């Protein structure tokens, strides 16, 4: 029994961390195969971060200007090239501890687990979740960037996430392993606004099934709803709509506990309408949206991964 | 900036997972040297876990009788004793990924990671922090057992906690790597209470340092305090009393924000007196007491670990 924000074991992906430095920029980049992942903003310095023309700054560094670093062994750097966002670094030996991976490009509301590293270093492990404003409320300081989200499906590796970037009000941003960003942001010094944040509604029910797993059952109320009359109650409090593909993905909670998704909307609306009155659900006085349909299954069934 | 419940990287501990196999009895093992540690129950049957006679058991059991299994190879068993409430299988093969390891037994209120494991495998890695009442809120299932809490400070690894029972109102009890128990508690399925569990007041003052540092200042209001005059009101909402040790502790946090221990301790009595009011700190409508203060430095500096 209980629940908690867990995060996938790191081991497959520590071996996977190194250190770039770039003049005095230094930052993490990601060691698969003979070729190193990291943010090409390693090449600008604090001036250049203001307005950086990637393409004109690029000109002007080599292949010796690019120090990668693995432990007290640093890499050799033979060849060099920019993919979107992200700088490939082609190095001399290949990662030994290269873990069978993936690369994807993960959808908002999906979850993940954050490597937080500095200087080429595992520092932390924590989950999170692709707000749908496609920003993430991770916690990363200076010289994070470049750390990795990923996943663990049985045996392979699904990396999804490099982080890029910090905004102004504290949430964080960054790309796919392809350079590609999440959202509409670019790597440029500059006052970027998010979009409004609002609430995985799919995420809400599959953490009140969980709920309901481990004791906590007083929000169950005695009515029922429909999709239609629930999602018109779902618009005003920002929660996105639920479909019948939600439907069915919850299927595997609402057949365990015996609670039709229908009538778990009903209890979501009230709680919505009239709050929680100072009781707790899971030891939490809010509705927590990070929790994915798959993750509370994993956590209420024991897969395991090698 | 941002804040979350951060674990330590599990890359040194998933090495040392194995799979301990008694009977049908099938639990989890940690593999360090020729040595494989795991709860002494593994030899139980289901009839014998209502009043195992631990003694006795032992004595119908050979060193063939355990079954132990790192990935698809397995470990021969060359000898075996119990050491209180753990069972020290020797084996013929040391562990070639033996991290440089220590054991240690905890205090109430410090924090650890667990790595949750079935059959052997990790399965995920959350943040715990030990209760006053000797009980930690984590999230195991059924063949759970084995998983071990552990700390990393710079290489070593600090292993403090083993599972071993689950407690009627859904939290966890264990021991420590020497077969101690934390809490009065005994490996006996029968009813056992846990006593009034109540809050660490100095890893929510830790807490509220760390939301200050990231924007959320709110709560802080004109007042000071005094020691003695805090006390009393903690008391009254079951909290822990604080100590000068506990205000030479928090130093760091108050230097670097510039506010008095006294002055949260002031700003902590009205949040206690007067509810937060719909309010949020750090994402969390309750206060936060499984951060001790170096867990916030750490998340605030970024100490990294290799």
């Given at each position: 029994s209980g629940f908690r924000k867990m995060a996938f074991p790191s081991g497959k992906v520590e071996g996977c961390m190194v250190q770039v430095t770039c003049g005095t920029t230094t930052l993490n980049g990601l060691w698969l195969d003979d070729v190193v992942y990291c943010p090409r903003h390693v090449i600008c310095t604090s001036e250049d971060m203001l307005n950086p023309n990637y393409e004109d700054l690029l000109i002007?560094?080599?292949?010796?200007?690019?120090?990668?670093?693995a432990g007290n062994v640093q890499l050799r750097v033979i060849g060099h090239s920019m993919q979107n966002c992200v700088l490939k670094l082609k190095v001399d030996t290949a990662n030994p501890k290269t873990p069978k991976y993936?690369?994807?490009?993960?959808?908002?509301?999906?979850?993940?687990?954050?490597?937080?590293?500095?200087?080429?270093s595992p520092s932390g492990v924590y989950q999170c979740a692709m707000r749908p404003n496609f920003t993430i409320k991770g916690s990363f300081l200076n010289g994070s960037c470049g750390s990795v989200g990923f996943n663990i499906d049985y045996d392979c590796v699904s990396f999804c996430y490099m982080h890029h970037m910090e905004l102004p009000t504290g949430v964080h941003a960054g790309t796919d392993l392809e350079g590609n960003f999440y959202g509409p942001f670019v790597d440029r010094q500059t006052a970027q606004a998010a979009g409004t944040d609002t609430t995985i509604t799919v995420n809400v029910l599959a953490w009140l099934y969980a709920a309901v797993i481990n004791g906590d059952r007083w929000f169950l109320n005695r009515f029922t709803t429909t999709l239609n009359d629930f999602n018109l109650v779902a618009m005003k409090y920002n929660y996105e709509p639920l479909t019948q593909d939600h439907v069915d993905i919850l299927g595997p909670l609402s057949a365990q506990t015996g609670i039709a998704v229908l009538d778990m909307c009903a209890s979501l609306k009230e709680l919505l309408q009239n709050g929680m009155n100072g009781r707790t659900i899971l030891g939490s006085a809010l509705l927590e949206d990070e929790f994915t349909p798959f993750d509370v299954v994993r956590q209420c069934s024991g897969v395991t991964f090698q």
């Open positions: 002007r560094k080599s292949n010796h200007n690019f120090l990668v670093q993936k690369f994807v490009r993960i959808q908002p509301g999906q979850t993940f687990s954050v490597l937080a590293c500095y200087n080429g």
